[PDB]
Amino acid sequence: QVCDVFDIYAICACCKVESNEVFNNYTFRGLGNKGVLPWKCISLDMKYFRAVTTYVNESKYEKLKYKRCKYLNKKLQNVVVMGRTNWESIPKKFKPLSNRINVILSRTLKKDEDVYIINKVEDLIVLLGKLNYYKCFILGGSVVYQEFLEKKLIKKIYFTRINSTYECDVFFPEINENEYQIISVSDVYTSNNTTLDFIIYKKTNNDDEEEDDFVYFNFNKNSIHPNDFQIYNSLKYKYHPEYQYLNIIYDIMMNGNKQSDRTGVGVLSKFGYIMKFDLSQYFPLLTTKKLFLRGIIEELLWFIRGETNGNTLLNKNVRIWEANGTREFLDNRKLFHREVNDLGPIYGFQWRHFGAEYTNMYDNYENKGVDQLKNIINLIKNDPTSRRILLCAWNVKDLDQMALPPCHILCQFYVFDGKLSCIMYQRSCDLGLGVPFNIASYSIFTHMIAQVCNLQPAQFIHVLGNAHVYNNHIDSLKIQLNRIPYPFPTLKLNPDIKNIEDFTISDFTIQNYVHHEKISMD
Amino acid sequence: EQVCDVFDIYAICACCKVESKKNEVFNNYTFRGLGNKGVLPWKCISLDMKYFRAVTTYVNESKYEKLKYKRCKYLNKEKLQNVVVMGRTNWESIPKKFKPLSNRINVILSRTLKKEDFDEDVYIINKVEDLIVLLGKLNYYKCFILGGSVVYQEFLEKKLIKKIYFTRINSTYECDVFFPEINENEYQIISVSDVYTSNNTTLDFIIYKKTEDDFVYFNFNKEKNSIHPNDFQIYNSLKYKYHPEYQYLNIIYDIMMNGNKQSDRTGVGVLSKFGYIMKFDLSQYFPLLTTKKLFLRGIIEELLWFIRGETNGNTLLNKNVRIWEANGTREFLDNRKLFHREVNDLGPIYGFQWRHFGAEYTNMYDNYENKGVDQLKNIINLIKNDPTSRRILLCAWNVKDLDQMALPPCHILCQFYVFDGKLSCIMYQRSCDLGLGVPFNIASYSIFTHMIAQVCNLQPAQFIHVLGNAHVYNNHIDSLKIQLNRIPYPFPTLKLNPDIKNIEDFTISDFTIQNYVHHEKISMDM
């Protein structure tokens, strides 16, 4: 086939377009608006474009030309192909595209030279056949893209997913998932007030003596069916940060220890993982299934007021703590003298009143115990290089009085160069149902603390102690592992809030959340 | 072109330590024992046999034509098996059932015996040069010199070895023949394996050496201190850095190269990073760092004092353990606003939180029996009676008591994990002095894991070290540059007196560190 011989690739940047809402690859399809780009200026895409359409490997060319000659008969640059409309839109100082053989497909133009013009697609394969070039990149225009994809002349699409909405005239054609497959996903980035990532579609099939040393050092190296993780195992580059979560799921399914549970539910378990999410580049809200945050934010606000009254949450239809406050749950816990939905000295109490005698959920605890939360905020503002900036919910004295002992043992904070990072240590991690919400909670918490200390959020670092997958989440997680993440959304806080106690539900906005379908984990 | 590169001649050996401990010096020549009375110095080390088999039988057919090409070129010409070469004494030592070595072309060096003296499928050669002639006329992948001391010695001196695959057997036996002293300018270590236990010894495997476009695109955005670099020449020369000690050393390198400059308490300045995990397999080795000398008497006395629930610094000072001396002084306590604290009364620190969390601290002499929560007793009962519990945590960070402590704990919490009769331990460290504290902290929580495992009738599995604020002191940088260019030794082992059934019944004499091999003392302070 002619795209393998001549190495014809497409490179495009697609934004989202105006009108639950359902998402798919076609979500990202905006190319142009009235002759020009639909977006202001996205310098990381500009930079990826330059490096991709510029890169040549002279050491690799011998093989390309042999192939090209054998198929025909016998300083290195790439070729770049544009439609006339596309060519028009390009400024001036960049106009004869640097270090690239500029080919222009037009039925109207002809002429300068060293800069080629072609009347038909077929007349590109002729020109390719007569040039020394490394690879051929189609820079498009909708029409150019439309016709090259129709003719099956594309080996890979280098597709930038610009995760924001613009007014658009012209759209990338709908890539058929039967003709092309995604093999690679980049890291997620923030450039010019949008997140974005870089994915690669490929056309489907329808002094190395230290290599033996590797084998020698490997001389001593679960009824899951990997063949069911086909999309997951096929991917070459899984750099999207959502793979930190998905890879842990894969590791527990493949290598996890079979253990029984309180009920006899059964888990696969492992011990000790770290995930790190860059809050400067994205908000890490899982995209491989639908996640809701109103509950999560109300829980955090409830913690921050130091509440222990489950009814405050139930009256707002936040039901996270409902099972933990029933008569039966508290009686099983030997809390015979505890009122229904009185969760005892849990998170909120330990954050605002650590060490105070707990009475009931209605008592006035003002100025009682250690206000750890106010203390960690003062340490951050007045002693940011302190290695003592910890918020601890694990009150050993109070554990038996809590509806249950906290899963989220502590937060530690780190300040460098006006930036705030947070470690949270979780003793017990329900990878299928809990951990996704848990990453979102403490990611939101890191933004709130950062903003009230006039700092920028940097990393949220999640340490997993007992890390388990429920045997009844395994089918749902097989489905989830075979979905390709989308670029992450962004979190906006109302910028007016400079005190940790002044946030309300309306101060929080998730932007550009693109996600696959809700999964019922059981 | 060199004969050893055309014909791909390698040596493979296993060397133990030899007969003669207080102020003892170690170097690569520590591991030199090859044999005793015409057999091996040790009974069975089955993992070394497994490794020897895998190296001497492995072939990549799809790389042979390339090697054929090269050999023909050099000689002026146009199932695949390795060759193995043995001295006659070596051959006679091998049990009958193992001869000739299966799936290998067997070659024996002899003058006294000829081919009529052998029943087996073997080539007899009476000089080194006839080996080279033979290799020139055989189809084979690689050639392994399996020794004899006389065979190794004559193949090294003649520069006919491209690499030595060297097993370091970290135990002492009676030897009468020895591997030649390797010349550090002829041969250099390029690679070091994981550390293993086999047949009640630790061992590792080192290698001496004779002295895609899509990937590029996804790295389009690749950008710190680099304010000492390639002072790490040996560190950076190594290809495979698999010894678990590199978990420690690689974090040091990461902090030096990418660390953030910040002030701290003392005002001495550090390089800092946030969030690391190390994991040590206590079933396979005791991770006592070997790139500098460490002593354990003090850290074991500290641990026993923690378990006793003690806060009296004078108890350690009377055993000549000074770990807590500086945090016990009038000036230290007064600068903490502990004006009403007696000298060396460290307040409600680790041992108090482990035995009496929640009790009102009075003084270091009070009897706190049955006050506060005995967390230590609770986790031992949880491990025995509820082993799948996700609540097996021992926590020293008592928020209420922080200001009463000489200083707040660095070692915040231990979480335990039980599967299949093995105990693992995560310890979370809020603040980690990589150059001085962390080496001791690894050894301390590794021993604790052993103690808890034994008293709950479990075997130790992993000690998992989580580092929060991980820092290198600027005054330690030159000392750590030295340490990082040192090649780790196979780790020692830890034995406990097995008669101890209760966490509280341990004493210093119940602990033995065997086969500690290390580089010399470093003063971290210049």
Ligand SMILES: NC(=O)C1=CN([C@@H]2O[C@H](COP(=O)(O)OP(=O)(O)OC[C@H]3O[C@@H](n4cnc5c(N)ncnc54)[C@H](OP(=O)(O)O)[C@@H]3O)[C@@H](O)[C@H]2O)C=CC1
């Ligand atoms: N987001 C992205 O990655 C990219 C976006 N764009 C945007 O898209 C728009 C440009 O694309 P769109 O309007 O389709 O225009 P195109 O660039 O696809 O241009 C179409 C023109 O190219 C010529 N042409 C097309 N097919 C042939 C053929 N088969 N043989 C000979 N000539 C042919 C004709 O020129 P003639 O008129 O001379 O006959 C045709 O009118 C702009 O808004 C631009 O900024 C462009 C590139 C990439």
Ligand SMILES: NC(=O)C1=CN([C@@H]2O[C@H](COP(=O)(O)OP(=O)(O)OC[C@H]3O[C@@H](n4cnc5c(N)ncnc54)[C@H](OP(=O)(O)O)[C@@H]3O)[C@@H](O)[C@H]2O)C=CC1
């Ligand atoms: N730990 C380890 O990795 C290893 C240990 N060993 C141990 O080493 C000991 C035996 O080794 P060591 O005593 O040196 O003896 P060797 O195995 O080195 O064999 C020595 C004999 O081989 C013959 N030989 C050597 N070189 C030549 C030559 N260039 N030309 C002709 N013949 C040659 C001679 O045999 P002849 O006298 O018949 O001419 C010589 O006496 C044993 O204890 C064995 O268990 C051996 C290998 C590896």
Ligand SMILES: Nc1nc(N)c(-c2cccc(Cl)c2)c(COc2cccc(OCCCC(=O)O)c2)n1
């Ligand atoms: N990933 C990706 N794919 C695409 N195909 C396009 C794209 C979009 C429109 C026109 C062109 Cl030529 C390329 C873009 C966006 O980047 C642009 C767009 C328009 C002009 C432009 O300036 C000249 C390039 C200078 C240089 O590379 O040195 C850069 N992104």
Ligand SMILES: Nc1nc(N)c(-c2cccc(Cl)c2)c(COc2cccc(OCCCC(=O)O)c2)n1
């Ligand atoms: N790393 C390393 N290098 C060495 N050269 C030797 C060695 C030692 C003595 C004789 C020989 Cl042939 C090889 C050893 C230990 O060798 C042993 C010991 C016990 C059994 C053994 O298996 C031989 C048959 C198994 C097989 O290969 O099929 C090999 N270790």
Ligand SMILES: O=c1ccn([C@H]2C[C@H](O)[C@@H](COP(=O)(O)O)O2)c(=O)[nH]1
């Ligand atoms: O914030 C939370 C609270 C709970 N869990 C999950 C982990 C376990 O499945 C269970 C806690 O049960 P124990 O570990 O207390 O037995 O709830 C979380 O993942 N996150």
Ligand SMILES: O=c1ccn([C@H]2C[C@H](O)[C@@H](COP(=O)(O)O)O2)c(=O)[nH]1
């Ligand atoms: O067991 C210990 C005790 C102390 N430190 C080091 C870390 C810090 O450099 C210092 C205490 O730091 P702060 O209290 O200032 O965080 O002691 C350790 O690494 N481990």
